Design a protein around this ligand. Structure first.
Ligand SMILES: *[C@@H]1O[C@H](CO)[C@@H](O[C@@H]2O[C@H](CO)[C@@H](O)[C@H](O)[C@H]2NC(C)=O)[C@H](O)[C@H]1NC(C)=O
Ligand SMILES: *[C@@H]1O[C@H](CO)[C@@H](O)[C@H](O)[C@H]1NC(C)=O
Length: 263
């Protein structure tokens, strides 16, 4: 496959994609601040199980806009008001402190977003889009929580900030670990936890951490929607992923692993 490869300095060239890099991408950071817009664009060959997603949120007077689009054809990365949502961010701690400024979405297909991440919670609330929406998806284990919600109606993302400790136990229990089979996901590190909220599937996923080529694995609790290559790709920076989810407590046990015609 081939794609444009561009550094943020605006210099680009055609890149012959490495074996198993099967996507092209454009990553875009846009910052509007009291009159000025700044923009940084990267392009490159990427590894699949990624989707298109965008997000805009307020920090003080600034607006920050994050975007990735991906595509499959040679050089397909070449060239490139509405619903009212709540918005806030974490850098200024505005999500957490409760100062939630209002934000009109610039595009008809954007919806209200809420996205929580931690391994120091990071909270971003604003306008954006993903293929799922409206919907939500989520994963948590002993030290990890990722959550995403999209709503189709006005200021629907208003509310206290979603924290794991306020979702009641599901009744489902699943094995918990992250790392590889020797480090972080050894048997001594893999143990049962109580699932919470709508995260009522046991999950295991393996793929290749993208930044460095190492094997990665994760186990825990998930929404059914989390059991999806792109979402796991996004959340853990992974690719060429095998996922399984199952709805019997402990069915996440590493001794119950089975490859899925990856194959
Ligand atoms: C992300 O959305 C882009 C935007 O269209 C998708 O790329 C489009 O592909 C269709 C089919 O070739 C074309 O009509 C458009 O020309 C493409 N858009 C542009 C601007 O080139 C792309 O497929 C999406 N990524 C995924 C995986 O959904
Ligand atoms: C597994 O985990 C750590 C690094 O993540 C490392 O010490 C070990 O060698 C890894 N195994 C492989 C195959 O990368």
């Amino acid at each position: 496959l081939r794609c444009m490869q561009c550094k943020t300095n605006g210099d680009c060239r055609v890149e012959e994609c490495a074996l198993g890099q099967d996507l092209c991408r454009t990553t875009i950071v846009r910052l509007w601040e009291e009159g000025e817009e700044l923009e940084l664009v990267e392009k490159s060959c990427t590894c699949s199980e990624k989707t298109n997603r965008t997000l805009s949120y307020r920090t003080g007077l600034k607006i920050t806009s994050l975007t990735e689009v991906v595509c499959g054809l040679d050089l397909c990365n070449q060239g490139n008001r509405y619903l009212e949502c709540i918005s806030c961010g974490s850098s200024d701690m505005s999500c957490e402190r409760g100062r939630h400024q209002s934000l009109q979405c610039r595009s008809p297909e954007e919806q209200c977003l809420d996205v929580v991440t931690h391994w120091d919670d990071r909270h971003l609330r604003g306008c954006g889009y993903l293929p799922g929406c409206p919907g939500s998806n989520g994963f948590h284990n002993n030290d990890t929580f990722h959550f995403l919600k999209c709503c189709n109606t006005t200021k629907c993302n208003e509310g206290p900030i979603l924290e794991l400790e306020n979702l009641p136990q599901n009744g489902r229990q699943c094995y918990s670990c992250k790392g590889n089979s020797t480090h972080g996901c050894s048997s001594e590190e893999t143990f049962l936890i109580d699932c919470r909220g709508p995260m009522n599937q046991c999950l295991v996923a393996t793929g290749t951490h993208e930044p460095k080529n190492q094997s990665y694995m994760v186990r825990g609790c998930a929404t059914a929607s989390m059991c999806q290559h792109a979402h796991l790709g996004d959340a853990f920076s992974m690719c060429h992923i095998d996922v399984s989810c199952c709805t019997k407590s402990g069915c996440n046990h590493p001794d119950l692993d089975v490859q899925y015609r990856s194959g």
